[PDB]
Design a protein around this ligand. Sequence first.
Ligand SMILES: N[C@](CS(=O)(=O)c1ccc(Oc2ccccc2)cc1)(C(=O)NO)C(F)(F)F
Ligand SMILES: [Ca+2]
Ligand SMILES: [Ca+2]
Ligand SMILES: [Ca+2]
Ligand SMILES: [Ca+2]
Ligand SMILES: [Cl-]
Ligand SMILES: [Cl-]
Ligand SMILES: [Cl-]
Ligand SMILES: [Zn+2]
Ligand SMILES: [Zn+2]
Length: 159
Amino acid sequence: FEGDLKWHHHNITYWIQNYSEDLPRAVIDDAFARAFALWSAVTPLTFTRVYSRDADIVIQFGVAEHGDGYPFDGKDGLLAHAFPPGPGIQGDAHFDDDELWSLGKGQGYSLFLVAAHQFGHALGLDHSSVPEALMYPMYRFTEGPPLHKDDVNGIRHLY
Ligand SMILES: N[C@](CS(=O)(=O)c1ccc(Oc2ccccc2)cc1)(C(=O)NO)C(F)(F)F
Ligand SMILES: [Ca+2]
Ligand SMILES: [Ca+2]
Ligand SMILES: [Ca+2]
Ligand SMILES: [Ca+2]
Ligand SMILES: [Cl-]
Ligand SMILES: [Cl-]
Ligand SMILES: [Cl-]
Ligand SMILES: [Zn+2]
Ligand SMILES: [Zn+2]
């Protein structure tokens, strides 16, 4: 997932290729939209849902081997990964459907928070060393605005 490029356009498009069997499609679509809204709220970036493989960010829920050199392991461990800006698989976000996807307090992992984190990568952001930042490499659920000052500065430094 090595990348040093940023998008050369601000009108970013995404395609929800498939869904997780843990949540209603309406809940999934809204979670992704809200995750994207976090980033557009502090930048001139916009996110438009499309239905084509030509979308910049292709969102895919997979299990085990799913098309790249980093197959998912299973329950826990790797929750998801995303490729840095660029053509093709670049910019795409993959989620391990072997995980229990949920939202808010309770068991399972928040699709909202994990997606927001992954979209950060798909925009060119690297991991943060700030434990409270959304771009921190370790998952942990908490309430309140996901974007930490460190996350806002990182994204604006790019766009
Ligand atoms: N796979 C990861 C770890 S991960 O368990 O899949 C992960 C950890 C945390 C994630 O976002 C997040 C960060 C803070 C709070 C809530 C959610 C998303 C994904 C990762 O950060 N992938 O993007 C790593 F570090 F590369 F191994
Ligand atoms: Ca904006
Ligand atoms: Ca792509
Ligand atoms: Ca896993
Ligand atoms: Ca699942
Ligand atoms: Cl599906
Ligand atoms: Cl798949
Ligand atoms: Cl949540
Ligand atoms: Zn993948
Ligand atoms: Zn990450």
